[PDB]
Design a protein around this ligand. Sequence first.
Ligand SMILES: Nc1ncnc2c1ncn2[C@@H]1O[C@H](COP(=O)(O)OP(=O)(O)NP(=O)(O)O)[C@@H](O)[C@H]1O
Ligand SMILES: Nc1ncnc2c1ncn2[C@@H]1O[C@H](COP(=O)(O)OP(=O)(O)NP(=O)(O)O)[C@@H](O)[C@H]1O
Ligand SMILES: Nc1ncnc2c1ncn2[C@@H]1O[C@H](COP(=O)(O)OP(=O)(O)NP(=O)(O)O)[C@@H](O)[C@H]1O
Ligand SMILES: Nc1ncnc2c1ncn2[C@@H]1O[C@H](COP(=O)(O)OP(=O)(O)NP(=O)(O)O)[C@@H](O)[C@H]1O
Ligand SMILES: [Zn+2]
Ligand SMILES: [Zn+2]
Lengths: 634, 634
Amino acid sequence: DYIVVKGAREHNLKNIDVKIPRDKFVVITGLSGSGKSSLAFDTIYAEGQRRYVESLSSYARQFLGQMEKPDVDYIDGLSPAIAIDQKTTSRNPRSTVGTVTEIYDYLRLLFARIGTVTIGGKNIYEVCCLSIGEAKEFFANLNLTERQQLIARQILKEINARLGFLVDVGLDYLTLARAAGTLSGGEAQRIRLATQIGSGLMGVIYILDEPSIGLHQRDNDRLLRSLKKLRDLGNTLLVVEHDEDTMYASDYIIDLGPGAGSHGGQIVAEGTVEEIKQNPNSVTGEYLSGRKKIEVPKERRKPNGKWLEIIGARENNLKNINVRIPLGVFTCITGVSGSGKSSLINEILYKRLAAELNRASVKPGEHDLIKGIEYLDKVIDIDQSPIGRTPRSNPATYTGVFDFIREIFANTTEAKTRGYKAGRFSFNVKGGRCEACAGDGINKIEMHFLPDIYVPCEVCKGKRYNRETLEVRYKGKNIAEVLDMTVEEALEFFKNIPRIHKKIETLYDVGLGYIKLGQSSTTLSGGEAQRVKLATELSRKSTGKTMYILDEPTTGLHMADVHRLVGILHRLVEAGNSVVVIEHNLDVIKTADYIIDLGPEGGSGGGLVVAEGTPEEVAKVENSYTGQFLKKVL
Amino acid sequence: DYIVVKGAREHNLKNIDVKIPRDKFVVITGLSGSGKSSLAFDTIYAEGQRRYVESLSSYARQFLGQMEKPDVDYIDGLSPAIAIDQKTTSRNPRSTVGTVTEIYDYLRLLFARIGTVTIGGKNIYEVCCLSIGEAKEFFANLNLTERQQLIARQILKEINARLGFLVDVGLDYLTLARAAGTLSGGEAQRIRLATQIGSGLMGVIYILDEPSIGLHQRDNDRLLRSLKKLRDLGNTLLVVEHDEDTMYASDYIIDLGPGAGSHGGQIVAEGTVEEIKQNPNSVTGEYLSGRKKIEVPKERRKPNGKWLEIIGARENNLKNINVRIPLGVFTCITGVSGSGKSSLINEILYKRLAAELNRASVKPGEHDLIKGIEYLDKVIDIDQSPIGRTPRSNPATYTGVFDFIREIFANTTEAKTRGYKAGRFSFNVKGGRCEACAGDGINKIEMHFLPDIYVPCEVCKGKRYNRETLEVRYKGKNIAEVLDMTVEEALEFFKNIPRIHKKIETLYDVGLGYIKLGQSSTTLSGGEAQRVKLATELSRKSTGKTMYILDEPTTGLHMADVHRLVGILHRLVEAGNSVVVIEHNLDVIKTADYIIDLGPEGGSGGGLVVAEGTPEEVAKVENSYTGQFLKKVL
DNA sequence: TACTGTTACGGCTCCATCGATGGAGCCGTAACAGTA
DNA sequence: TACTGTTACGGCTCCATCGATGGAGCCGTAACAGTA
Ligand SMILES: Nc1ncnc2c1ncn2[C@@H]1O[C@H](COP(=O)(O)OP(=O)(O)NP(=O)(O)O)[C@@H](O)[C@H]1O
Ligand SMILES: Nc1ncnc2c1ncn2[C@@H]1O[C@H](COP(=O)(O)OP(=O)(O)NP(=O)(O)O)[C@@H](O)[C@H]1O
Ligand SMILES: Nc1ncnc2c1ncn2[C@@H]1O[C@H](COP(=O)(O)OP(=O)(O)NP(=O)(O)O)[C@@H](O)[C@H]1O
Ligand SMILES: Nc1ncnc2c1ncn2[C@@H]1O[C@H](COP(=O)(O)OP(=O)(O)NP(=O)(O)O)[C@@H](O)[C@H]1O
Ligand SMILES: [Zn+2]
Ligand SMILES: [Zn+2]
């Protein structure tokens, strides 16, 4: 009936007790860095996997891999659990849709056990090179004999369920032979969801960590309907989401908070959506109830006569459209997943602007020409791919600050007298780091089947530096203490140095005032990593006439975080710059002064400019789903 | 709280609903063939394993191996389960004790992670070639540094728990370098128990199928104390046992019945031991309450002046003892497990009697000479090893009956006119079997990861024979119907043929009147297989002066079955023969007219004749545990 | 003279046991070029 | 002349992905020898 958890202190959870109902729709909400992922995936899923693995033999444990033991005391009512990780997975080019979704293995088994080899007048190759919808239709009309049906009932059932889920989510325009490495974000997310939650089971806990990455509102609604259908089978659903639709379509909501990092990790509000709204201490309830919201501008800026014309854009699935992008205003490029907006913007506009301004060597997409490039001076872009996590990377090194800090540290009098350079003051370069731990600071000993044990180094005491490097101090603080201070302390510490102060203020402006400069990248959260990347790309100097291109910056960001980002972008636009954002979040779109809509479908059915104009104008077009969704908001 | 199971119809269960309490000691009792193993290991363990496996990936499922789906509807309250199979496992000579118990892997990990390689002034080899007790003492006195203790805490804990369990069960005389293929039955059983139930867990269901194979009463009591200690950790224990001690030391007993085979598969009585005793419908309660029991003879037969003297027996661990075996009476060779009774009897007495009577070519053990061999004519022996299970074997072929049946079938007029032989009338010989199914009758299609599906053959319709072979009938019945009749029908069908009637009556005398002549060996139960082997060895002709040697014939036999066997043996002895039985069951021992006791311990501490004489005389020796246990019974 | 032990010999079935490689991202370093 | 774009290049880290063999037992068949 319940999955009651008591005494949870993993990561930053402050010894909280949470009771999760079974066989229901439960949503974990909170700010970026609250501790939702550490609460679900790092505690409940870890405990379930460890308990199910300890009962197996040593050989099976070695061949599977046990995860770390959660720092939780009481966990009861658990069950076999299937979890989908928040982090995106990169697929090698050899992988295909059928191989990833495992439909290819079922097809091979069916053809080996039933092939006389053709099944229903079709060999393996012609059904492998087939669209999902027509493959489902062909498999639902099979007329094999009774003996074959008895032999291969389970294979047929699994294939039918998987193809039904893939059709339900809205992915019937793809082919089983399509490479997985050439798909959009939303399509790849749907494929990943279909891989695990495709063939549903009974009495199994399902854990989903933000399953709506790069999905439109229509795709999100379809996925929600599929999830409700799956839950009706008698399963438990635990979803960590920042979306309003998922919060509204749920039976129970557990809200963490009240902040992020060291200031969060507790439970603030619990109950249904209304109880969340009526609780003052809940930030999510405050945003849902409308007490705090992203302000829609009554007056929208008009273009100043300067336009960016894209003529003959036919890259990927684009059907030779002409799109005009106004300059000097905030423009949002919206559309259903797979409609062809990223393949337009990031593959033509940015790849041409960089080539013509930053002297890059990137070949753009298939297009005729772009008019109006002379009106800009530089282009700054944020890709849709996530950041790479390494233990040798921290936000200080990520946002180009470590170079300046090492330079100033090497510029001190003691460093000059000792004949040192900036290389010594880094833990990734031989000479200044503690060679016993190779600059790691902590040591991770890995066993064969038992969980790993982390033992800190005793030579450096976790400071990653030897005595010689730590003997030189700048303004009374060494480099270890410089790396150990939060972003607010660095801002208060580098006031008189504009070069470092600019980047530190950029980091602080996105809401990372609690993040230590030396916190490991692997330990960073998804939202914190996204904000770190945003600060990295937004800390660069702007000339007043520049293009800002953002590809889904809402990934892993709460309502407060996207409100902060919207304010930053609006100030940047008011400074004189022009911003183009590929967005799926309605809050960001409703504040845009111009919208370019693509559709009306995804895949081969899209690539046409359905709507173009201000949000009020777009809301009057019933053909586009974006207009239908914007009509309710306005 | 409960593991409630409803709608169970696997094998021969007749749609019964059973509620099993959690965190308790539960014993499943019943006759041989009732359905206890099919109720626990084939249903509850199968469901638990399948549910825990379905949540893993396809690769993990392929690398692990999913078992068959039980034919059960409702199962709730399950948990990760560890089960020990009833069937004994044969180990290759390369295996050792440490390798089997996995202590060798933990030792290697500890020496690789802590070795400077010597730990505590000892290398790997000197601790590998060490006794269990002294190894435990050495590991409990380790004085490694704090950092090493923090690094290797889990390895030390696991090693200490495993060695503690091995010492508790009573294996302190063994060495980690001892080959697993040269151990006794009880020692191998205890090693198998230590492999899985050694390092206990929390909240895990433990399923044990007859864990007291070849164990004395003292060893059984020690194992029971260990099991109670394990259950006190907060686990559930489900043991399928025929022992009285296990039934008495339990919290709940679920009794199946009321018979065996098609006549059983239901639930007769439930509750504690007293409630079982007070239920008339329960056979186990009737035997426990003393209403039905194995009768102890008031007068015991005395030796007739003919004795079998073994002089200088020093095989294995025997310390050069001289043992006198009376002839013409029932003799039981008893002692603690590992004391050296099998290595005496089956390695000297039988191996010399066969060589001197049946003209065998087996080299006996290390002994000086045996006097009195001229007093016997032949020797019949039953080994302690279990039978081999193959789908090409059935009880009719096992107990030498199929040869006679094929001979008489080939002797018919139609077979003579058609020019056939006895080879055609067998499903393991080309020519008479259905070549489509190769005589298997049923077809088992095996997948990669999905459970196998059994589809019967359509050419032969499961009769394993073609039309030509089935066209010839003897006494109105073909060979398929001859194989399809039970043992009672065969007894009523072969009344006028003494050769077949003798073997059929021998099969029926052990309680196998419901077993079809063509039932597969792999589908046979452990007790049914043991009784089949007993009938095979007891169906041979006796000359009136012959030696019968039995090595633990109680394996898998209920109280009623051992009562039937005791009656058979007593009638055989009264016929003029002499029977020597190596026994651990007190019911068989209390009826013996002479007992030879070995001990007083196992391994290197045993091999001495502690007691020798009638049970009343043996009960007066306090040095022997057998006497102490016999004192209470008498 | 036939029944009952042994042996060999061919064919069938069951059961125990023993992570590396390629692709991608990031950090530090160097060099080259455009612009205020 | 210094600040800010680009490129390359070496070293480090993370993540996705693709059952066979030997030993033992059993069945059918043949041959050989001892005994009632
Ligand atoms: N290399 C490629 N070759 C062929 N088709 C491709 C390729 N890359 C992407 N596509 C297809 O082009 C269509 C548009 O994808 P793309 O424009 O990259 O993403 P998008 O529409 O912005 N979706 P999303 O990022 O989720 O909002 C989809 O149907 C993709 O499957
Ligand atoms: N090893 C660690 N020790 C202490 N704090 C940590 C550690 N790893 C992560 N954190 C912090 O713990 C907080 C919660 O982490 P996590 O649970 O991953 O975030 P989250 O709330 O799910 N955010 P998001 O995924 O963006 O919605 C973040 O502020 C992390 O920086
Ligand atoms: N090949 C062998 N070499 C050395 N020791 C052996 C060998 N086989 C058995 N032993 C040991 O001899 C002792 C007696 O074993 P054995 O007499 O065969 O069994 P047992 O006493 O009848 N036990 P059980 O069958 O369980 O009642 C035990 O300590 C065995 O480990
Ligand atoms: N496939 C089958 N179909 C029908 N009956 C079967 C099948 N397999 C086994 N049986 C019979 O089902 C009965 C119960 O089997 P099983 O559960 O293995 O016995 P058990 O009661 O545990 N006996 P034992 O292990 O000796 O104590 C026996 O009479 C078997 O012969
Ligand atoms: Zn160090
Ligand atoms: Zn057939």
